[PDB]
Design a protein around this ligand. Sequence first.
Ligand SMILES: C[C@@H](O)[C@@H](C(=O)O)[C@H]1C[C@H](SCCNC=N)C(C(=O)O)=N1
Ligand code: NA
Ligand code: NA
Ligand code: NA
Ligand code: NA
Ligand code: NA
Ligand code: NA
Ligand code: NA
Ligand code: NA
Ligand code: NA
Ligand code: NA
Ligand code: NA
Ligand code: NA
Ligand code: NA
Ligand code: NA
Ligand code: NA
Ligand SMILES: [Zn+2]
Ligand SMILES: [Zn+2]
Length: 259
Amino acid sequence: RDWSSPQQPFTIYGNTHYVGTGGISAVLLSSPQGHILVDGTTEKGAQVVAANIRAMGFKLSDVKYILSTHSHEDHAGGISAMQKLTGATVLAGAANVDTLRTGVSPKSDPQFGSLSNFPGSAKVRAVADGELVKLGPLAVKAHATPGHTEGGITWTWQSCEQGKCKDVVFADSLTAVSADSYRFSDHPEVVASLRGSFEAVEKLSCDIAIAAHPEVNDMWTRQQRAAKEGNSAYVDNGACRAIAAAGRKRLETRLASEK
Ligand SMILES: C[C@@H](O)[C@@H](C(=O)O)[C@H]1C[C@H](SCCNC=N)C(C(=O)O)=N1
Ligand code: NA
Ligand code: NA
Ligand code: NA
Ligand code: NA
Ligand code: NA
Ligand code: NA
Ligand code: NA
Ligand code: NA
Ligand code: NA
Ligand code: NA
Ligand code: NA
Ligand code: NA
Ligand code: NA
Ligand code: NA
Ligand code: NA
Ligand SMILES: [Zn+2]
Ligand SMILES: [Zn+2]
């Protein structure tokens, strides 16, 4: 389950399909009027994601938007390639637009000094907190969830099967990780941003959570459960609370370690 590994795609609920790699989530939200892709995975992973979209019966040329959680190689490295293959517009939080364009994270990033660059994308545009992305019948909401990066966005929508609907959340990373030379205790904006983000995420309507790193909400255990239980195995309306709690615990452990 490396970041760039093949992974047979699968439908999670309704028109929400997992098209990511073995290690990094990417989601296609489909419609007859075109599709939205969330994240690109790695540069090498773009070829996996593209093949997976086609394996689900969809055309790349019908992907109209690519939504970015945040601008690190593991989630965004494949966006540039996907953008070329699709012609889509890339949407991101304001403070991550320049990073997506260039593929270089800035000095404000806690991991600056330790990150690998990734390919810059074309057609990158900003969205604001609370903003709706509409495409035909699709409606995806942006929630600012800064901390891991300044422009991190968590994306939400509803998917339905014969009128039975669920609230789906593609949860951005909420993790306090850094270069060796970085002290969170010296950077109050980052700490405040992380804390605000745990609070936002634990309040979301959240039947089905798909974490950027899929194991964060036990995707693979859930998929194994689903073989017998069906797609209810993906449903757990405490998942966003649990992702937020794990974020909080990581930060609190880190601040304690810094004293
Ligand atoms: C560039 C880094 O951000 C990347 C790396 O290993 O290089 C990893 C580290 C953390 S934590 C990874 C697993 N998730 C834990 N909650 C992470 C993320 O939370 O998105 N990505
Ligand atoms: Na694959
Ligand atoms: Na591009
Ligand atoms: Na476009
Ligand atoms: Na973003
Ligand atoms: Na950034
Ligand atoms: Na960044
Ligand atoms: Na651009
Ligand atoms: Na971080
Ligand atoms: Na994470
Ligand atoms: Na520091
Ligand atoms: Na520093
Ligand atoms: Na798992
Ligand atoms: Na079921
Ligand atoms: Na269930
Ligand atoms: Na369940
Ligand atoms: Zn990251
Ligand atoms: Zn990551």
